[PDB]
Design a binder for this molecule. Structure first.
Ligand SMILES: Nc1ncnc2c1ncn2[C@@H]1O[C@H](COP(=O)(O)OP(=O)(O)OC[C@H]2O[C@H](O)[C@H](O)[C@@H]2O)[C@@H](O)[C@H]1O
Length: 248
């Protein structure tokens, strides 16, 4: 039997095309300065921070560290795979209205990818990190967007190297712009493409904080950076702790 909430979420899945970029900027403009934004940095999984926040959250959204080319990246240790094995996210990402995001990214033939985003609303979370069922499913909105593949740019098209950071900065701006357009109050962010995509975890942490300090200042109630780091040296998490300290 089909799981509860899957059909409503798949039916409501929506694509933001790159020609909507100024619609998303204006939504950020219009929402600037609405609250006192509290921003933590934690050790939890994206979905752990989600299930924590949901009882305080009018409008909960979390960022999927997405593959540009096939839904779920084709599945092993990555965040998007965490989200799919424990939620109905995959049923949304394979929806018909989302096909253009995967189709155009493939035709792009560029490691920086395009500026399409997938908004999946009310995605049921069914399991915790240990993998056990949940009493009741807890729903979360998911913005899906690929960070530029810094690793593939360096190994395949170094000419685009100077474009990695601008690309990541404008794309992060559209992610917050989607969240503002959908009037979301609580954002679960993280180490967007600092694992398999090889981006510099210091760079994405400061790019986030720059926008949270400028264009997106006050735009959301509560931002949670849920950076999972199992490596003993803890360099990813330590980069977001270090870089987000002034803003909290
Ligand atoms: N379950 C998790 N929950 C929260 N944070 C996590 C989790 N797993 C890892 N992190 C942290 O988030 C950081 C980045 O996790 P990554 O998934 O590599 O995102 P990307 O930007 O590199 O590219 C994702 C690609 O890899 C996949 O194949 C996708 O399909 C894409 O093709 C990790 O280093 C962790 O510190």
């Amino acid at each position: 039997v089909r799981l509860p909430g899957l059909a409503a979420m798949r039916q409501g899945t929506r694509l933001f095309t790159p020609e909507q970029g100024e619609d998303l900027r204006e939504a950020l403009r219009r929402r600037r300065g609405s609250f006192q934004t509290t921003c933590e940095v934690t050790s939890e999984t994206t979905f752990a921070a989600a299930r924590r926040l949901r009882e305080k959250a009018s409008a909960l959204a979390a960022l999927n560290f997405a593959s540009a080319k096939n839904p779920g990246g084709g599945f092993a240790q990555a965040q998007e795979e965490d989200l799919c094995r424990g939620s109905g996210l995959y049923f949304s990402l394979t929806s018909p209205q989302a096909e253009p995001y995967y189709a155009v990214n493939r035709q792009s033939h560029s490691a920086l990818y395009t500026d399409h985003l997938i908004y999946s609303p009310q995605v049921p979370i069914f399991r915790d990190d240990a993998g056990q069922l949940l009493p009741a499913p807890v729903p979360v909105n998911i913005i899906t967007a690929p960070a530029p593949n810094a690793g593939a740019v360096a190994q395949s098209r170094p000419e685009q190297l100077p474009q990695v950071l601008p690309t990541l900065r404008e794309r992060a701006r559209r992610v917050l712009g989607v969240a503002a357009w959908m009037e979301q109050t609580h954002l679960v962010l993280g180490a967007w493409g600092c694992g398999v995509f090889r981006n510099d975890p210091a760079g994405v942490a400061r790019t986030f904080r720059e926008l949270l300090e400028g264009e997106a200042q006050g735009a959301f109630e509560h931002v949670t950076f849920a950076v999972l780091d199992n490596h003993p040296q803890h360099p990813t998490l330590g980069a977001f702790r270090r870089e987000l300290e002034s803003l909290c």
